């Protein structure tokens, strides 16, 4: 049916550069705003950043902003993150966060209402 | 040649219960159609549909436009409105066009023409209050290119008929400008009644007082309990304890049921239904759309992700396409502050007995999809935004209902008369620049209300932001980054 | 000052250059090549 | 920034109210959703639109915001509803979307 | 028209505003759902006919004799407070056909109605569109024993009511079909059908019943067994109960005179053809149950009764068609103005010692008094 | 009295529209990608001369009653039926045929700003859609007055 | 002793460039 | 008066939307009155 | 006031005090002392 995959996650040393894709299947990847969350060992998870259906909006988290790149494939149903000076903060397992809504952009404008209604299983990234 | 023939002006003058807004802009007006009249039909651009058949021709004169809010407003002056006023109505017009400077593809042309006339008397197709693109841009710096005029006619398929009539605009008397001459003109709006900028703060079903029973009865029992034969009839008293079956002098406004749509896409149905399952009118055999129809709340209390399938007026934000653009490109606009005295535009009317009841025979009830006026109902008009339009013509007909357009405004027997402007044929490679101002009275109705409490305001975001809103980015484009309705204020109902 | 001598803002206005000859709904991009020139007098 | 108690516990059978406060930017402004993380596996969507609940979630989880402060409640408590909750929302001032802190349920 | 009576007005609330929602009630349903607010003014309502074509043309309203007891005593230093509102600022609650009234018989002593109103709610709850209003931050005269208030109203011109009973060019007017019932229990269906069979229309999400609706004949000629179930304006007999009254409790209205103009309520208005016929169909046809205005319409209001109410007011809104309320009478966009009236709340011993908070000790009291209504 | 109307409109209610120029409204043109399941989105599009059913417009076409293209069209008063004549006035017949005409002269040059006598006044939804059920419509066999309406009265 | 010696007065009048507000309050005072 | 030029709009002080069970400004179901926050004065825009 | 102007300040004081009630019974011979410090 639906499903979310997340590859790209492994073992890399500091201030090397890897990119973590999410292949959507089993819907229309086209029209739905996309997120990635990630969550450090046996730590709260974080919203890291976010991107528009037609990629138009985006969204960081203050943390990663500026080291990190975002981009999105329709065409392949592929959701991508970029990283760049990567410090060893960045050890987590990296979720794709898929949100159903487009309230935020067309119906209102004080507040996004977003929430997220599907979830990716995640890969680890560790720095060592 | 060389003396300015007009200036400058763009203000707002905020005086007692009258605003007077002036907006000056620079214009280019081409030479659209090489001086030509050409006949235009589906058939030229293939005439795939019936229902989007259409015969009328294409004309070179070129018309200003500033039938939308934004160019006699700026965001502030909006804000100012809206907030501190129960309503308000064009009262007079002053419309001037000077700084005449013609070209030739570049070199200037000092001996030539500009043809510029208004038609008062409205024998000319009335284009301007069909919601157009063209208007005076909502940025003073921004210099606009002159939408061409055409018209339509009766058809039959891509074919014209014996009764459809032909207009020939050079039969028209106009004034002739070259580079020194101004344009001027002045207009009076008819008397129409003050568009209502508020949120009503009581519902038509809830006008009653609390602490009292009526005296008025209803039917509570038709049946004593379980068993045989345990027909009876029991009056309780109407009172606080139940509000929904006391006796109203009142009922709610019309409605015409559309569909609903979900903001969330999951939550849609998984086919395609925009025309398919679209509330529309039929008209000599086509079937019109009803966009955005009759008044009516875009949603029920708790359900903002919800929206009628043609019921609102969607605009667009800046550097949006023209076809199939994506759900965050658009803005639309919600029409829940009328849900007091209006029906849910996804909801039915009410219910109506279907049958007699008997012995033999239960009682049973139909939905009532859409419901015509009625005795006894009040309703609000749809509201007007600043990006949306300010008055219609009314249709010249034996009888109207309630005039009022449905797109928003003021209707109008005699709204402002058109104007028309070409360059004059000299073919030489031609066009022509200048100035447009265009300055609006209106009259202001001042809110007395003893309302204890604080009301609800327009109001621009507190948080930080790349941008501010409502104004220039790095590039130095100008983008309305919202709608803004006319209601936050309240009175009673 | 309160009140001191004001801001006297000045600029060219915009002559834009041909247009499409089909009606286009942005604002015009294409401008000629402009500048001015002339006397300032100030007396105090 | 979203604020829970850190872990809350309950006997099976119990009602179970897991609230965290939020500021005027976040919580009043916008709508709070509540995520379910069991120990191996990813999170889930509990609660979305304040009350609203999504298809195949059990009618016990009930969740409610008043003023600034969301609470999510848990009532008839089972061995099996020991998990991580998260409650999140759209932050104005950060511009960013913000998790609560977490909240452990443990059941004895 | 003159009118005179004497008046007994208490003390509501412990003069206090108090929120009042279906939550303070026991919550009720949707339907019933509401928040307001309760008053300790009181008001006077003269709207029904037997407190005094034609129509009204003036008014004046007299308020003397004040008197006021302390609990008895005399207190010949209170005041008793009132006020019209004449630019409609209050929720207007005339024109619900509440009780209240002054008694018809003109010796009665009546207790006026204590005022209250409704604003907006999501259910029990309020929305920031609801608006509190303040009696006391309108300007109000002050009376005490020796004083007395008058003042006088202008009615706003309508029509006539009128009084009477009556191819083609004009056809019958609107119709919103009722349910029918008989007054011989036997031939109603053995089910219960008052709330799940009436006519209702719905707004925001509450469905409200249909009463008593467009005007319509009550019943077809030679039926008089029949009565619309929310059609009819329903009259309790003299000392009639409150809840589930009997059917020879009660007096239930009827509105034949206008059958000659107008549809019958439980009839269908008439019927339409719902396809082409050709060789292939048959034509068919369909009921209409509820029908709009038509060009050609004619109509009749729903006739005025001695227990009926006399005016209404018609809301403000953008647009309306033909105002007249449906429950009868003459609407106005100004129709005549509520008068609210209170007792000055007198505190009883305060501390010795200032203490900020409000004074919640009063000393127990009522007023009573002459009212005369001239129209 | 107002003067009888003695003219026929050379202008169709729904083309009053300028057909140079596209609107500034949009109207939702997609929902669904196609041919797959959970292949749900909003799409939408200017408004313009190449689609004119879906544009906005600020006036629609007067009240209706149906008739039996040539089963009595009826109004009940008293119990008593009566047969509907002439009636509200409508369009005798759709341009193209004139064979037709209602069960019960043509008044054809109001067919500009009145709807057909023997056509539906058209379409309204009769329910909510949803992932589960999808929308439906039904036809609107007679219409009151609604507020923006224009009509003309009958011809002399 | 029966007559009033005044009336309640409580609003807002807003007057072009300035306003007139209006309170009247019901006081105790103790010994 | 506020005579201001500024062409985006202003912050302004605005009653919420959202739903609540009492109203700020307004008594509660028991009749006592209150103040939910402090309300400053400042929030049109000058110049420096 | 504060959404529509820049500034404000007061210009003039009216002060009123009326229908005076001393105390229970009524005690309709006393009296009550007031005073302004100009």
């Given at each position: 049916?639906?499903?979310?995959?997340?590859?790209?996650?492994?073992?890399?040393?500091?201030?090397?550069?890897?990119?973590?894709?999410?292949?959507?299947?089993?819907?229309?990847?086209?029209?739905?705003?996309?997120?990635?969350?990630?969550?450090?060992?046996?730590?709260?998870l974080?919203?890291?950043?976010?991107?528009?259906?037609?990629?138009?909006?985006?969204?960081?988290?203050?943390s990663?902003?500026?080291?990190?790149?975002?981009?999105?494939?329709?065409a392949?149903?592929?959701?991508?993150?970029?990283?760049?000076?990567?410090?060893?903060?960045?050890?987590?397992?990296?979720?794709?966060?898929?949100?159903?809504?487009?309230?935020?952009?067309?119906?209102?404008?004080?507040?996004?209402?977003?929430?997220?209604?599907?979830?990716?299983?995640?890969?680890?990234?560790?720095?060592? | 040649?060389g003396?300015?023939?007009?200036?400058?002006?763009?203000?707002?003058?905020?005086?007692?219960?009258?605003?007077?807004?002036?907006?000056?802009?620079?214009?280019?007006?081409?030479?659209?159609?090489?001086?030509?009249?050409?006949?235009?039909s589906?058939?030229?651009?293939?005439?795939?549909?019936?229902?989007?058949?259409?015969?009328?021709?294409?004309?070179?004169?070129?018309?200003?436009?500033?039938?939308?809010?934004?160019?006699?407003?700026?965001?502030?002056?909006?804000?100012?409105?809206?907030?501190?006023?129960?309503?308000?109505?064009?009262?007079?017009?002053?419309?001037?066009?000077?700084?005449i400077q013609?070209?030739?593809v570049?070199?200037?042309?000092?001996?030539?023409?500009?043809?510029?006339?208004?038609?008062?008397?409205?024998?000319?197709?009335?284009?301007?209050?069909?919601?157009?693109?063209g208007?005076?841009?909502?940025?003073?710096?921004?210099?606009?290119?002159?939408?061409?005029?055409?018209?339509?006619?009766?058809?039959?398929?891509?074919?014209?008929?014996?009764?459809?009539?032909?207009?020939?605009?050079?039969?028209?008397?106009?004034?002739?400008?070259?580079?020194?001459?101004?344009?001027?003109?002045?207009?009076?709006?008819?008397?129409?009644?003050?568009?209502?900028?508020?949120?009503?703060?009581?519902?038509?079903?809830?006008?009653?007082?609390?602490?009292?029973?009526?005296?008025?009865?209803?039917?509570?029992?038709?049946?004593?309990?379980?068993?045989?034969?345990?027909?009876?009839?029991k009056?309780?008293?109407?009172?606080?304890?139940?509000?929904?079956?006391?006796?109203?002098?009142?009922?709610?406004?019309?409605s015409?049921?559309?569909?609903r749509?979900?903001?969330?896409?999951?939550?849609?149905?998984?086919?395609?239904?925009?025309?398919?399952?679209?509330?529309?009118?039929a008209?000599?055999?086509?079937?019109?759309?009803?966009?955005?129809?009759?008044?009516?709340?875009?949603?029920?209390?708790?359900?903002?992700?919800?929206?009628?399938?043609?019921?609102?007026?969607?605009?667009?934000?800046?550097?949006?396409?023209?076809?199939?653009?994506?759900?965050?490109?658009?803005?639309?606009?919600?029409?829940?502050?009328?849900?007091?005295?209006?029906?849910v535009?996804t909801?039915?009317?009410?219910?109506?007995?279907?049958?007699?009841?008997?012995?033999?025979?239960?009682?049973?009830?139909?939905?009532?999809?859409?419901?015509?006026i009625?005795?006894?109902?009040?309703?609000?008009?749809?509201?007007?935004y600043?990006?949306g339009?300010?008055?219609?013509?009314?249709?010249?007909?034996?009888?109207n209902?309630?005039?009022?357009?449905?797109?928003?405004?003021?209707?109008?027997?005699?709204?402002?008369?058109?104007?028309?402007?070409?360059?004059?044929?000299?073919?030489?490679?031609?066009y022509?620049?200048?100035?447009?101002?265009?300055?609006?009275?209106?009259?202001?109705?001042?809110?007395?209300?003893?309302?204890?409490?604080?009301?609800?305001?327009?109001?621009?975001?507190?948080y930080?932001?790349?941008?501010?809103?409502?104004?220039?980015?790095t590039?130095?484009?100008?983008?309305?980054?919202?709608?803004?309705?006319?209601?936050?204020?309240?009175?009673?109902? | 000052?309160?009140?001191?001598?004001?801001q006297?803002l000045?600029k060219?206005?915009?002559?834009?250059?041909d247009?499409?000859?089909?009606?286009?709904?942005?604002?015009?991009?294409?401008?000629?090549?402009?500048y001015?020139?002339?006397?300032?007098?100030?007396?105090? | 920034?979203?604020?829970?108690?850190?872990?809350?516990?309950?006997?099976?059978?119990?009602?179970?109210?897991?609230?965290?406060?939020?500021?005027?930017?976040?919580?009043?402004?916008?709508?709070?959703?509540?995520?379910q993380?069991?120990?191996?596996?990813?999170?889930?969507?509990?609660?979305?639109?304040?009350?609203?609940?999504?298809?195949?979630?059990?009618?016990?989880?009930?969740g409610?915001?008043?003023?600034?402060?969301?609470?999510?409640?848990?009532?008839?408590?089972?061995?099996?509803?020991?998990?991580?909750?998260?409650?999140?929302?759209?932050?104005?001032?950060?511009?960013?979307?913000?998790?609560?802190?977490?909240?452990?349920?443990?059941?004895?």
């Open positions: 049916e639906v499903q979310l995959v997340e590859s790209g996650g492994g073992l890399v040393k500091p201030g090397g550069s890897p990119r973590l894709s999410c292949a959507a299947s089993g819907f229309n990847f086209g029209s739905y705003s996309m997120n990635w969350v990630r969550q450090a060992p046996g730590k709260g974080e919203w890291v950043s976010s991107i528009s259906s037609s990629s138009s909006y985006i969204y960081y988290a203050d990663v902003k500026g080291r990190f790149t975002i981009s999105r494939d329709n392949k149903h592929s959701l991508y993150l970029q990283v760049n000076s990567l410090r060893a903060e960045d050890t987590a397992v990296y979720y794709c966060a898929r949100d159903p809504t487009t309230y935020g952009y067309n119906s209102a404008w004080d507040k996004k209402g977003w929430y997220f209604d599907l979830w990716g299983r995640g890969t680890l990234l560790t720095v060592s | 040649v003396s300015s023939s007009g200036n400058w002006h763009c203000d707002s003058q905020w005086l007692g219960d009258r605003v007077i807004t002036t907006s000056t802009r620079t214009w280019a007006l081409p030479t659209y159609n090489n001086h030509l009249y050409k006949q235009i589906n058939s030229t651009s293939g005439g795939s549909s019936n229902d989007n058949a259409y015969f009328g021709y294409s004309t070179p004169w070129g018309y200003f436009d500033f039938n939308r809010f934004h160019c006699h407003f700026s965001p502030r002056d909006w804000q100012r409105l809206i907030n501190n006023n129960w309503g308000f109505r064009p009262k007079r017009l002053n419309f001037k066009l000077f700084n013609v070209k030739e570049i070199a200037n042309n000092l001996t030539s023409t500009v043809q510029v006339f208004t038609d008062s008397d409205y024998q000319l197709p009335y284009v301007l209050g069909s919601a157009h693109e208007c005076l841009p909502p940025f003073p710096a921004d210099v606009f290119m002159i939408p061409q005029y055409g018209y339509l006619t009766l058809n039959d398929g891509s074919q014209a008929v014996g009764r459809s009539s032909f207009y020939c605009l050079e039969y028209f008397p106009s004034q002739m400008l070259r580079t020194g001459n101004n344009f001027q003109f002045s207009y009076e709006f008819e008397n129409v009644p003050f568009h209502s900028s508020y949120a009503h703060s009581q519902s038509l079903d809830r006008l009653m007082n609390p602490l009292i029973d009526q005296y008025l009865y209803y039917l509570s029992k038709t049946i004593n309990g379980s068993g045989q034969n345990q027909q009876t009839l009056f309780s008293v109407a009172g606080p304890s139940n509000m929904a079956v006391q006796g109203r002098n009142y009922i709610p406004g019309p015409y049921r559309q569909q749509v979900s903001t969330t896409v999951t939550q849609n149905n998984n086919s395609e239904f925009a025309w398919p399952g679209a509330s529309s009118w008209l000599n055999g086509r079937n019109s759309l009803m966009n955005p129809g009759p008044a009516m709340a875009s949603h029920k209390e708790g359900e903002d992700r919800f929206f009628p399938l043609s019921g609102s007026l969607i605009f667009g934000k800046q550097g949006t396409g023209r076809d199939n653009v994506d759900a965050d490109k658009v803005m639309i606009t919600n029409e829940e502050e009328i849900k007091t005295t209006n029906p535009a909801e039915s009317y009410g219910q109506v007995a279907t049958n007699h009841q008997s012995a033999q025979a239960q009682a049973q009830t139909g939905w009532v999809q859409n419901q015509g009625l005795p006894g109902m009040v309703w609000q008009d749809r509201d007007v600043l990006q339009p300010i008055w219609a013509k009314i249709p010249h007909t034996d009888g209902f309630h005039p009022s357009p449905l797109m928003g405004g003021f209707g109008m027997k005699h709204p402002p008369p058109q104007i028309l402007i070409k360059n004059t044929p000299v073919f030489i490679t031609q022509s620049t200048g100035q447009v101002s265009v300055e609006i009275e209106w009259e202001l109705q001042k809110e007395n209300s003893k309302r204890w409490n604080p009301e609800i305001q327009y109001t621009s975001n507190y930080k932001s790349n941008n501010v809103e409502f104004a220039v980015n590039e130095g484009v100008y983008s309305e980054p919202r709608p803004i309705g006319t209601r936050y204020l309240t009175r009673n109902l | 000052m309160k009140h001191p001598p004001p006297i000045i060219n206005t915009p002559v834009p250059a247009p499409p000859t089909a009606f286009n709904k942005d604002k015009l991009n294409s401008f000629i090549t402009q001015s020139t002339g006397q300032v007098s100030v007396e105090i | 920034v979203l604020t829970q108690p850190p872990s809350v516990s309950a006997a099976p059978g119990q009602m179970v109210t897991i609230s965290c406060s939020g500021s005027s930017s976040n919580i009043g402004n916008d709508y709070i959703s509540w995520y993380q069991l120990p191996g596996t990813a999170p889930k969507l509990l609660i979305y639109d304040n009350n609203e609940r999504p298809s195949g979630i059990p009618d016990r989880f009930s409610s915001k008043s003023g600034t402060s969301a609470t999510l409640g848990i009532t008839g408590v089972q061995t099996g509803d020991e998990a991580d909750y998260y409650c999140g929302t759209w932050d104005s001032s950060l511009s960013a979307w913000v998790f609560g802190e977490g909240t452990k349920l443990t059941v004895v």
